[PDB]
Design a protein around this ligand. Structure first.
Ligand code: FMN
Length: 290
């Protein structure tokens, strides 16, 4: 089984990647997107989004990270893809879900990137089922394969369905997988060991990507792969303590907000820390127990 850590712009950055990968077995993390328009972005932008590039594309604990690009113009997707790779990125990812209601644009963008990235390095594309309909989710999928992309992440909802749980369609992901000859990584609504098993049995995918769930349960990759139990609240606290010592984070409150769905003890700690960065002391104060 492969488990990928999703890109979560405004939630996951290099610090949380280093934190999480330490206590997980993610096969690969995708960075938050590098926004591409019509310019080659400076080296400094890539290093800042992806500090791992200077560590052979790995978090300190050794988990691979891949730079993601977001954009439309194939020429510039290609030049930025080449630069990502020159700087050390283990392949490059293309965001087509945060998007493109034209399979031709996905085809051209991914192709330019494939040709611009050294053939032995992966070029992956992340998509949704469709814009306002999942009709010809095959067109999109065909586009990606025909472009020469290495693998396809499919978020099992259309753009309009947003993040509504009742709209997740793992079977659609399966129909795409049956049709293609590159790996399909199932994404969306994977929260625990059982939902992962349900997803893979229905889609037939042996690879999944987890986003929001990876914050609700900090060791979700090990939960999914090994049916490890969820990380114990004292360990979560110990982890949030380590987070404070990694150095300005208001993402801490955001994380605690995520943790409220799974850990009862998080709702009180959320209220405490909600309402200056003395929050560091408050968190660092707690004795583990309990
Ligand atoms: C806050 C937030 C930020 C996201 N940022 C990105 C992103 O930068 N690039 C991308 O391809 N998808 C992004 N996504 C989409 C997710 O990676 C993922 O496909 C989606 O959350 C569904 O997976 P999940 O149900 O496991 O969370 C983002 C989603 C959320 C909620």
């Amino acid at each position: 089984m492969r488990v990928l850590l999703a890109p979560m712009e405004g939630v996951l950055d290099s610090l949380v990647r280093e934190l999480l990968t330490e206590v997980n077995d993610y096969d690969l993390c995708i960075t938050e997107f590098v926004r591409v328009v019509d310019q080659l972005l400076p080296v400094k932008v890539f290093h800042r989004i992806c500090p791992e590039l200077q560590n052979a594309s790995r978090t300190p604990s050794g988990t691979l990270v891949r730079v993601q690009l977001l954009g439309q113009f194939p020429q510039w997707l290609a030049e930025n893809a080449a630069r990502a790779v020159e700087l050390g990125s283990w392949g490059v990812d293309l965001n087509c879900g945060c998007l493109l209601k034209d399979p031709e644009l996905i085809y051209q963008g991914a192709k330019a990137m494939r040709e611009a990235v050294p053939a032995h390095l992966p070029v992956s594309v992340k998509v949704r089922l469709g814009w306002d309909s999942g009709e010809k989710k095959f067109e999109i999928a065909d586009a990606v394969q025909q472009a020469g992309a290495t693998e396809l992440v499919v978020h099992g909802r259309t753009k309009e369905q947003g993040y509504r749980a009742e709209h997740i369609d793992w079977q659609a992901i399966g129909d795409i997988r049956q049709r293609l000859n590159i790996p399909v990584i199932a994404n969306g609504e994977i929260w625990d060991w059982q939902s992962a098993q349900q997803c893979m049995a229905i889609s037939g995918c042996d690879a999944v990507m987890i986003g929001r769930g990876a914050l609700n349960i900090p060791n979700l990759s090990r939960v999914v792969k090994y049916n490890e139990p969820r990380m114990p609240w004292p360990e979560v606290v110990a982890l949030l303590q380590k987070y404070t010592r990694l150095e300005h984070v208001a993402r801490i409150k955001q994380w605690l907000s995520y943790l409220r769905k799974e850990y009862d003890e998080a709702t009180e700690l959320f209220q405490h820390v909600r309402v200056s960065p003395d929050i560091a002391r408050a968190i660092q104060a707690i004795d583990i127990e309990k």
